[PDB]
């Protein structure tokens, strides 16, 4: 039939998939009212909290037909609020997003008028995007404009965080009492920081009051609708909603149902406080819900079916919240409606032992049934994980819509401990976003933007000149024709890297200050370890752990490029640097013999070939060494991860031909995957190549693999997938995820998209509809190596 295990969830799912993407202007209006009332009369943290509270008090609330869990970010499903305190769109922005080819958002004429007349006049000079851009150096602006790197905080708040367990043990009235206790013990005689603590703690208290009002208003809304509903079954559902909201979020949840509603209210809260990267996620959902599940079934108020029904409702709620609209580079690097709410199922419990429980299997059943691209429902696989759980996950992956990805629990824990987390805290951790490792509920781990490693080699080969933007973007490391050795070339590359990282980090530091001062998040601070105890907002270092990342893109492309140069120019001496540079400038036109050599007669990453893989390691180590351990403004350090989202398309589009044989404006490699056509020795050879990268020293790496549908059939096919995951993870690989599609279906979908509106594929760290992808991205996915066992 229709997807959904029950008639209720079938109906909720059909509403969700039919909702049209559009913008909701109410949030911007209410924030404007609050600033006009309060700006200049209070410190900024209190201003944000008072503005959030004003928004919560006055926004319109809705309950959709059949819901058991309530709460929407916008006016209706697929309605995105706007965030003019971060990015106040131009009228052209609104025109572009309404009319663009993919990832469009409808802008009603009423929304356009209000934005033009009320929002722009107030927020255009206040938006943080202008504070950032106006503070960047000309070197940063040139590099940014040339596609050397991206900037995550230009249109969104740092975000990128995961809920802990606080909201299942405390309500917001409890947290407020904790905050009031902290306020009473501030020592203004001897603690010279007491004033800053008071401002942040006062804001947190106001945020708590706002959450109490959220629950109060939804309970009223539910009862007012109950008096008006004639259908007896619906009225009882409305009365159940009201009873649930009488408890949460003001008080700690007492039941499994209340635990889910508490999480979802907090989710609505933090993602309307600010437009945070990767929305929000409960993280280790099966660990938090299992005590409630066991208690509730034992008391006879819950069974497996109702527990599954509630989670199917939750799944639909995620799918009703798009990532708010992006423009410019932010869209190019994250070209999707999804908001990367990553759920980790399986793994280990807080004591460090096997965490698979009954809720874990329920989550696998609901993600299988619902087949929704939000949330991003993934599994943590431990050496302690039962093989039955892994094989069930492989069963779902083999169906070919991308979810779940697989994460190595032992790698995650060691990555966290390498970064300074205690073993006790690391056992609560996991991955969020695409593949990013973090200590859930206790860490600010902020991604700052992608770094175009292949184009750094391009700058090296052009003495700092960018052949595409036709500007001097890098530094003068020398004419490559004078390099007498591969070591000399690699040293020049490392100098270009150092310069580009220095440029990025300097801008990052400015941006970190701007976000801390102008984007404090008192609501998020209330639920993140150490903010209350420290009296310090999450956005300026209140978390127990603080890290920042620069995301490395294109390791396969640059590995094969430097490998091609070492092999052909310096070792075998089949041609010289001058000839290679002419070939690149001509996009290999007139140099077909060179193209054949570098493409087809040269070692390649992903074949368990140490000639290429040792170069991968050298590049990886240089990147790790250049970035890791640099201080952040708010008391943490920089670390390294490797993922592209859709930025590998953009980074290749503004790059010329590269020495490995990739042609001008083609995408660079995705994640740590091999280059196009690079791996010719099967999937075991590539996981052996990928394992030579030291995953433990990163905050996560992304590996895509693709299988022919015929080679994963039957029980042997499941075992082959399961065994590949185990083999990779036994070598301490971080992550792997699978495409399993018929190439001809994708090709047909390109010719007749309207017949394939349901076709979903794996992109990079998330799944999306094939029809939401540009032709270039579609062709990138189709070109990935079709593996056989």
Author numbering: 1 to 789
Authors' account:
Elucidating the activities of uncharacterized enzymes present in the human gut microbiome can enhance our understanding of this microbial community. trans-4-Hydroxy-L-proline (Hyp) dehydratase (HypD) is a newly discovered glycyl radical enzyme (GRE) that catalyzes the transformation of Hyp to (S)-Δ1-pyrroline-5-carboxylate (P5C) and water. All GREs use a glycine-centered radical cofactor for catalysis. In agreement with all characterized GREs, HypD is dimeric with each monomer consisting of two five-stranded half β-barrels, anti-parallel to one another and surrounded by α-helices. The Gly loop contains the conserved Gly residue (Gly765 in HypD) and is part of the C-terminal glycyl radical domain that is found in all GREs whereas the neighboring Cys loop contains the catalytic Cys434.
